[model samples]
Target: PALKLALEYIVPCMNKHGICVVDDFLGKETGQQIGDEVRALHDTGKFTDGQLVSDIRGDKITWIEGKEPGCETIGLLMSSMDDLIRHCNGKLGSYKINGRTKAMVACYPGNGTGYVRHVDNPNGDGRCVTCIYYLNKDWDAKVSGGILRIFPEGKAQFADIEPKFDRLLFFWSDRRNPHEVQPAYATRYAITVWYFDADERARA
Candidate 1:
């Protein structure tokens, strides 16, 4: 069900803007379960050097695996990765593959914690797809400014996407588009995954 809907919009949106956002990404029930899990596990997250930008991103991160204990939600999400890859390839005749190189939790605290506009795979790793699932529940734009600002290539006006609960964003990585997260007035939680090509995975 999700894959069907995902492909319908994903291909066209990505073709036009190089990104796609699916509202209520995993359904409310499942999304809440995962969100609660993230909230519970966030205390153990490690601080990042802001993705090598040094304070550009103000969030704590923890890497996750599908089969890891206490990561059922992540496991469930991982189960769909291959399917998403297949759908993308089928629709667009692309060679996107799931390298399973990514999957992490990002916790951004309130009061101006955010990342600047930048590409996902600046180092040209195996990464090819950027996937983000928002876990912020009851989020309000006025209170929480954690909007995902998307800058499509060759476009003038950028798109500001609110990080609403159960929303999933998928986009082309590898310098296709530049994006950023706005400051949040409330704590923010999100799941991020980067899909890589099979050859790239093998090299890595």
Candidate 2:
């Protein structure tokens, strides 16, 4: 219900502005479930160094998994996430991948507060959606602001969010667009994932 109402506007907002924020997108239940599972994994002290690719590990990022080694936490958090995907499919009318959904969660912390900006991998031919489930809460704007910044006018409308819980942001990932996250303080946590069709999964 919330996803549909939000999508009507969000899908377009992103097209025109490059970004859109849906406050309280997951309500409390789903958001908290994702948040709790991720927090537990982080607390386990098993976070592996995050590598941009082979031979490059950035100190600014790390993650853990509640699943098999090399597998991410998606399966661990999929029960609730499935519902979210189903809701998205309903709005989509025809899911590119029948019933199979693929996604991944990322945890990016503040890297010394100078501003960290990066674009997600461009969606391959069949990839259709990108969803970011915010797992942060009660963050002060002054000390920490890991806002998802968008250059709406290529260099205008730059902005931010404190990233409270119960919120999810979705967007269409394409090559022509570029976006980034403003540096955050303390620990910035989020479950950023995507949905793709069978063809797209094959491309991955």
Candidate 3:
């Protein structure tokens, strides 16, 4: 009931606006601690190259599903997000959310590392919603230029999002939202999750 009510407040904005950005989405300490944890994992070489090409994405990434050691907080978030999707589908009949992608812990080092403009699912890969949590603590946009540049539907002007600490960004994963990560002069970090429709996955 609580989750249902919570989404009630946010869903209207999502329905009206093309996207939603929340500050302190993971609360104060949780976001910082997740940042600390991912930094440790990166320093220990737990992540791998993003694996497309340098021009597309210059970032290292690791997948987590909440069961890994030292990742309890993200695990909790994963569970909550799963339930939130289920509860959300109850209210919105058209939402076909059935499964989710493993949470992506992506890290970008300096020297102009950034992801080019693209949609998460250009085709029917089943992905619907894209949720991202920023872990860059005390990030200075002037020094670090890894702002998220997004082109919303029907808008002539695009929007720029700062990779600030604990910021959570939510939007559709399809072509309606085309976005890119600007050049990151300093180390940047973000974790992302995508919920998919099982039927759509089967089709893919």
Candidate 4:
């Protein structure tokens, strides 16, 4: 019931606005564990009526606020993600980052979304970098869904990324970064962290 409700909420939101973010999901445990968590939450009376009332506000496109003020929900995931960004930035050395990179996690559940062409992110000024972590344990490379379609060279050609557990896909977010989540059998949970240069650019 909980999964159904969450999906129902996402569908309308997606249809009306195109996309929505499931913020602060922890894909740390196994698939069974994650499934159990979703089931248990469904049993709770708070969500039985099929309503999700998150504190995060929205305008046209939703940017669900990054967890609560000091919640460690996202912090734990960052323990690994932060390292990857540092390594990447280091490799590129003296890159455009202005200050410490800020990280946030967003989840795209399992659904059969049709073909979606990619576009550049409309962040403050724009997005500098993006990293996506796929949370499907039984994912398959031959599968059509869950491919992180990216165009590295500012053209129509794209590179597909399979959703692998513990694997992180990082890339620059410019006119060339066109990406999307292909439909999957189950919820396609994942973590997304952004790397920016300035503290002032951080979205509150």
Candidate 5:
């Protein structure tokens, strides 16, 4: 029943608004463990510039690996996500949902650092879908500035989405789906992944 409720809203919302959010996507304890792993990597200087454009993307990132130490939750998370994607594809038979094989962990440290507004499929990167799983425990938009500003379709104003713990955010990746992250006061942690249409990968 819960899965159905999630899909019911998620699919229709994506088709209409291009974005949707799912709260408590993972278990509380598992989410904490993932956050811990991210911190450990950050402490070891594993994260670095997420993009080449200095002003476009400011978050530090490290690719998640299934074999990496203390990353067991990644596998579990991916499995659940994959199932959701499959369900979406099955129900929305006309649209085949594609998903990325791996996800990247991102860290936005304090002191006003963020990514500029941009679409995920710029320059034909083949990004048909994008997902972000936040790991910030006890997050508050007022104190921490790293909130996802989603620019909905046919709207001039953007919506501020908080980076709450265990929240799963996914969206269609296209020119119409523009978004940006606000600068953070304290360190912000999240995981992001991109997916492409089966044929789109040829152009990416």
Candidate 6:
């Protein structure tokens, strides 16, 4: 019922505004344990800068299938988000929802590392709904400097989102939602996924 209510509240918000932010979506324990898992992965240097480097992005990232041992927490989060995608498709009646990307686990090493403004689906790559789950326990955004700045579609104004613990942020993946991460002063951890549309999935 809690999941139903949360999804119920967020679906309409996205329908009208194209963006929504929910705090404590999976509660503290799930967030913390995942944080620990990512940290352990980082220890082994599993993350990398990939091809996106410099001002565009300086975060080290790795993909998570959430299927391995010690990965149950993230798997749970992924399952719940599948519910969110199903709920979204049932309510929106478009998108033709069809699975999602694996969890992109990221660790932005401190000292002004940040990503510039960009849209996840600028060229129509099948991505529809984008979701980011944060796991920075007791994070002080003012000190951390990893706040998300969102540029809503057709609007001159913008919105800032703090990377609070257990926060879940969702938004459309197209140019309607251009966003960027501000320079981070403390190490930041986050996981992101994008639900795809069958139309575009097979289209692309």
Give the best candidate by TM-score.
Answer: 6
lDDT (tens digit, per residue) of candidate 1 on 1-204: 656765677777777667888887668888888876777676544434344435354776888876766678877876675566566664532645756555788888775778878898877687877888888888997877888888877778888888899888888886667898888778888888887776666675
Candidate 4 lDDT over residue span 1-204, tens digit each? 224423454334433433233323344464344334333333442122211224321111112233433324344455554544443333332344543334433343334442255554554543555655455666774663656666555355656677666555556554445666555544454556666644325552
Q: Write the per-residue lDDT of candidate 2 for residues 35-91, one digit (tens) a residue.
A: 666666667654555535335432233332335553333454554445555644444
lDDT (Cα, tens digit) per residue for candidate 5, span 123-144: 7666677888899889988987
Candidate no. 2 TM-score: 0.66
User: Could you tell which candidate, 3 or 5, scores higher by lDDT?
Assistant: 3
186, model 5: CA deviation in Å? 0.7
| Local accuracy of candidate 6 as per-residue lDDT tens digits, 85-184 | 6765455436678778999988888867788899889998999888999888877888889999999988989889888888888888988989999989
Candidate number with greatest lDDT: 6
lDDT of 3 at 83: 64
Query: Could you tell me how far off, in angstroms, the CA of residue 97 lies in candidate 1 after the best superposition?
Result: 1.4
Q: Residue 26 CA error for candidate 2 (Å)?
A: 3.6
Q: Which residue pairs collide in model 6, if any?
A: none
Give the TM-score (vs. native) of candidate 3: 0.88
* TM-score of each model, in listed order: 0.86, 0.66, 0.88, 0.55, 0.87, 0.92
Cα lDDT computed for each candidate against the true fold: 0.75, 0.55, 0.79, 0.45, 0.77, 0.82
Cα RMSD (angstroms) for every candidate in the order listed: 2.8, 5.0, 2.5, 12.6, 2.7, 2.1
Ranking by TM-score: 6, 3, 5, 1, 2, 4
CA shift of 40, model 6, Å: 0.9
| Model 3 steric clash total | 0
- Where does model 2 exceed 4 Å of error? 2-18, 51-81, 88-103, 109-116, 123-125, 152-155, 159-161, 197-204
Instruction: Report residue 77 deviation for candidate 4 (angstroms).
Output: 2.0
lDDT tens string, model 3, 125-192? 99878888888879998988999999986789788999899887778888889999988999898889
Pairs in clash, predicted candidate 4: 98-197, 99-197, 109-188, 110-187, 110-188
